[PDB]
Each structure stands twice: as C-alpha cells, then as structure tokens.
C-alpha cells in the first residue's frame, strides 16, 4: 500500500475544509473533503446516467446517450426523461471536476509543491464549461450543448461544425489546431531527447543536459533548455485549450455565418479589392 519512499510525506495537514476530519488515504488514494465531494458527485452522476439508460431503454455503452433539453425549453428546467437528467448530470460533472481540482490543491499543500497541476486542469474544466454552460447560455438554450454519449457526442461535433460550413475556416480554431500539433511535436521531442540522453549507445555513459542542449543546437540552431521545455509544453497545451474554448464561445454568438466568408474582409481591402487576376478577380 505504500511506495518505498512514501511514509515520510504522509503527515497531517494541507486540507482546505474540515481540519483532520477527512485527512487520510484509502490505498494509494488521498481522500480529503473534496475526495468525499468527488465520490458523491461522481456517484450521483453515474447513477443518473444508469437511470437515463433505463428510460432510453438500453445498456449498450455504444448506445447510451443523455441528450440536453430540446431547444424549445430555452434555459429552463425540463422533465427528467426529456433533458432534466442531462441538466443534473451536468451539475454533477461540474461538481466532480471542480472537487477533483480542489482535492489536487490539498495534495499540493500537503506535499509542499506548486499549484501548477490543478491550475492546468482548470483550463480543461473551462473548455467543458464553455460547451455545456457558457455557450448554451449566451445562445439561449441548453439544447446547444453536446449530449453525453460516445457516438452521439461525435454527431454533435459534426453537425455543429457543418452548421458553419467547413469549420476549418474558424481562425481561432486554426490557432487551436496549431497549438495541438505543436504540442504533440514538442512532447515527441522532449520524450525522445531525455530518453536518448538517459539511454545512450550501448556501453556508453549517460549523457548530460549539456549533450541535450548540444543535440538541439546542432540540429536546428537553438535549444530551449530543460526548464524551458517544461514551460513550453505547459504553454502549448494550455494555449490549445484556451483557443479551443475561444473558437467555440464566438461561434453562434458573435459569428454565426459560414466561417469561410469571414476571410473576405482581407480580400475586400480597398487597396486591392478591385485589381484583376489572381484567384479573387
């Protein structure tokens, strides 16, 4: 039940709510007030999903789907079997996610580390909330939110995207994708670099960070360094999610036509709008 070095760190303290009341573990899992909150929110949410499954009339995980209130309900309540369960499951999900972050904070305080992890997680929660809470509210109905189902959430992505034509043309989406791709590139390179240094050619001694800097300077003329790369991966991946939430919060609110047409502002600039030739004259 304990890692070999673990005991020295399992002291009292660090909780945000309840003093020592929930200051303990279960196997490897820290508990805390927010561990109790997470369990409660998650347990309810799962039970409601199973109830939703019964009212839909299936137990196949590829078929279970919990749909938000139809558009006619606006931002009000709905009968449970017609959107209300979705509404409650969503409160449960949010409670669980926020609880999970706050429990992470408690672990941080006990361990004497920085809060960077729950802070980064909060970006993911904010993206979820953009799709199920902020965007639906700004747009006037719960029904614009995605449904909770494995394949049905994908139908939603598709239908939402095609509502605006090829969603590729959302410029905030373009920035988002760039961050995603760049992040995966950086992850591949960080992983490969450290490993290539820790596991050198057969019989050779472990390389050093100097070799890591040297390899990258040789390769491309720059190295961000070992603090830099962990700053980078954090930045790239949080920026991707930031721009993801941006690209959706502005869709169906400030912009709601075909995203391809947005790009006409550049082509129609007076100085060149009317010069013939090229693609657009």
């Amino acid at each position: 039940a304990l890692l070999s070095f673990e005991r020295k760190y399992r002291v009292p303290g660090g909780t945000l709510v309840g003093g020592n009341l929930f200051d303990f573990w279960v196997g490897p899992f820290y508990v805390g007030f927010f561990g109790v909150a997470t369990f409660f929110f998650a347990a309810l949410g799962i039970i409601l999903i199973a109830w939703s499954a019964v009212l839909q009339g299936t137990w196949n995980p590829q078929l279970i789907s919990v749909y938000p209130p139809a558009l006619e309900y606006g931002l009000g309540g709905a009968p449970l079997a017609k959107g209300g369960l979705w509404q409650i499951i969503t409160i449960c999900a949010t409670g669980a996610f926020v609880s999970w972050a706050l429990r992470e904070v408690e672990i941080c305080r006990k361990l004497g580390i920085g809060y960077h992890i729950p802070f980064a997680f909060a970006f993911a929660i904010l993206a979820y909330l953009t799709l199920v809470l902020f965007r639906p509210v700004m747009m006037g109905a719960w029904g614009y939110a995605f449904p909770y189902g494995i394949w049905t959430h994908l139908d939603w992505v598709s239908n939402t995207g095609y509502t605006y034509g090829n969603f590729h043309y959302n410029p905030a989406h373009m920035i988002a994708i760039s961050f995603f791709f760049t992040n995966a590139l950086a992850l591949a390179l960080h992983g490969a670099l450290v490993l290539s240094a820790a596991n050198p050619e057969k019989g050779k001694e472990m390389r050093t960070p100097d070799h890591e800097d040297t390899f990258f300077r040789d390769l491309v003329g720059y190295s961000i360094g070992t603090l830099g790369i962990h700053r980078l991966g954090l930045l790239l991946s949080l920026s991707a999610v930031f721009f993801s939430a941006l690209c959706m919060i502005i869709t169906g609110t400030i912009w709601f036509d075909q995203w391809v047409d947005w790009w006409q502002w550049w082509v129609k600039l007076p100085w060149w709008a009317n010069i013939p030739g090229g693609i657009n004259g």
Binding site: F5, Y9, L187, G191, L195, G228, R231, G233, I275, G278
Partner: protein
C-alpha cells in the same frame, strides 16, 4: 503572489557555450548566434551554434527549392502582381496532376508537372533531414529516439503524399500545396470516405492528440511544481532520485492511484505523441484502398 517559474526573474550569462564535442566534426559547426534577452525570459538566450555538414546543406537547399517552386507558381497565379499575391496568398494552390495521368511523370508543368517537382524536393528535404536527426545523435553517442519519433511523423506525411497515391493508382490523390486548398482537401477526404469519425484509427489518433495535450499539461505542470527541488534536472533525478521526483510521483499516486518515474514519464510521453501519427497514417492508408466508406465498414463492425 508566490513566484510561479513561468518566466525567469533574473537572467545570467557567461561565455558562449560551444557544446559537447564527443565525435562531432567541429569543422562543421557555425559560431554562436546572437543572444536574445527576449527568449531568455522563457528559455535559453543563446542562439547557435548550428551544425552544417553536407547532408545539412542538401536538406536546406532542397527544402528551399520546394518552397520556391510553390512560391513561383503562386506569383504566376497572381499574374506577377505583388498586391494580388498578398491579397490572394491563402487562395493560391499548387495542385497535383489530374487523375488521367495516373502515376506517370508526363503531365505538363502547368497541370501537375510542377507539383511533382515541388514534391520531389520535399521528399529529399525531409528524408535527408531525418538522416540528420540520426547522425547528430550518433556523433554525440546518444540513443536514436529522436530519429525513431520523427519516423512516426514521416509515416503520415509519406502516406498522404506518396504511399496512398501509389496504391490508389494516381498522383491526383495527393495533397495540394496551399493554405486553404489543403484544408478543403482534408474536408473533402472525410466527405468522400463516408466521414472519418467512423474510422477507428481517426478516433485513436484523436485520443492520442488530446492525450498529448493532457500528458504535456500534466508533465510540464508537474516539473514546474517541483522545480523548487530541482525537478527539471531530469537526467540526474533518474540517476539519483531526489525529493522532486518523489513528490512528483506521490502527487499522482495520491490523486489517481498510480504514478510514473522520472525516466518512465518520458516513455509515456514519447509513445502518447508518436501514436498520433502512427494510428493516423494507418487510418488514411486504409482509406479508399481497403475501405471506401467508414460508415459502411462500421455497420459491418468491419
């Protein structure tokens, strides 16, 4: 406000660092570039040196030729008019030969010939650049992980521009060179293959792409959270575990009930990332060669 180690408070500099020598041919290294104080708030201030060498020159020249072959075509499409070139920059497109030319090199310059020449230059640029990731690790006595990982990106690229077109029987299947046209190509590829969302390899690829952001957010944030105990000195934490690596592991053990090591996190990392393009390239390679319509295939569960 506690200091968060996102940006440095104080930069320091000393003699330009010329790097480790090992077996590198030193005749092929530039001198150091300038130092960027701007960069230095976030990473290293030093630029260069860089390694030239014959493979390096080849790859660079070839990559430029690719870039310039597309750009000349763009100027041509613009009727040599600077203002139209800028106006229409994202709209230009160097397109591959029409279906009727099959896999032959007999299409005219203006209808595919130029695309083939650009592609040829891209091919040698990328492969010789791959050779470089291998050789720079070799000269330093390092493992080959970088070249192995690059090979996974190269796989999707090769599939899209070369392997899949050859299997389909024509260059017209490849991707055009253009900002907007490549996006239209992407949208159209999905539409024509009955929606990529039904390709299990596309879904896997997404799981990994998202998974990379999840993982790098986790790792990046963890290292920073333990940088007050020297966390980012990963290689020496591998060789001689410190309290940084232990607090890291325990954060995760307490949160989600398992954890990594200082070396092993980097193995999760490399694989989360390369599997994006490994599953990706498979999903594309199967598209139209074996499976015409992912929705249809999915209805037969296969």
């Amino acid at each position: 406000a506690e200091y968060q180690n996102i940006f440095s408070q104080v930069q320091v500099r000393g003699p330009a660092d010329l790097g480790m020598t090992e077996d590198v041919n030193l005749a092929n290294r530039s001198g150091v570039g300038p130092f960027s104080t701007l960069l230095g708030w976030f990473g290293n201030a030093q630029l260069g040196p860089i390694y030239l060498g014959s493979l390096g020159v080849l790859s660079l020249f070839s990559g430029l030729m690719w870039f310039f072959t597309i750009g000349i075509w763009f100027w041509y499409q613009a009727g040599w008019n600077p203002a139209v070139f800028l106006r229409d920059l994202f709209f230009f497109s160097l397109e591959p030969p029409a279906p009727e030319y099959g896999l032959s090199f007999a299409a005219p310059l203006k209808e595919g010939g130029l695309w083939l020449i650009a592609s040829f230059f891209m091919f040698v640029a990328v492969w010789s650049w791959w050779g470089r990731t291998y050789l720079r690790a070799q000269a330093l006595g390092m493992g080959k992980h970088t070249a192995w990982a690059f090979l996974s990106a190269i796989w999707l690229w090769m599939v899209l521009g070369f392997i899949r077109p050859i299997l389909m029987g024509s260059w017209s299947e490849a991707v055009p060179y253009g900002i907007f046209s490549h996006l239209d190509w992407t949208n159209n590829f999905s539409l024509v293959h009955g929606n990529l969302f039904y390709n299990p390899f596309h879904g896997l690829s997404i799981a990994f792409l998202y998974g990379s952001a999840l993982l790098f957010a986790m790792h990046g944030a963890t290292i920073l959270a333990v940088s007050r105990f020297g966390g980012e000195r990963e290689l020496e934490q591998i060789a001689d575990r410190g309290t940084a690596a232990e607090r890291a592991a325990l954060f995760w053990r307490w949160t989600m009930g398992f954890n990594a090591t200082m070396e092993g996190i980097h193995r999760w990392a490399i694989w989360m990332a390369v599997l994006v393009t490994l599953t990706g390239g498979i999903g594309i390679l199967l598209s139209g060669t074996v499976v015409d319509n992912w929705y249809v295939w999915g209805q037969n569960h296969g």
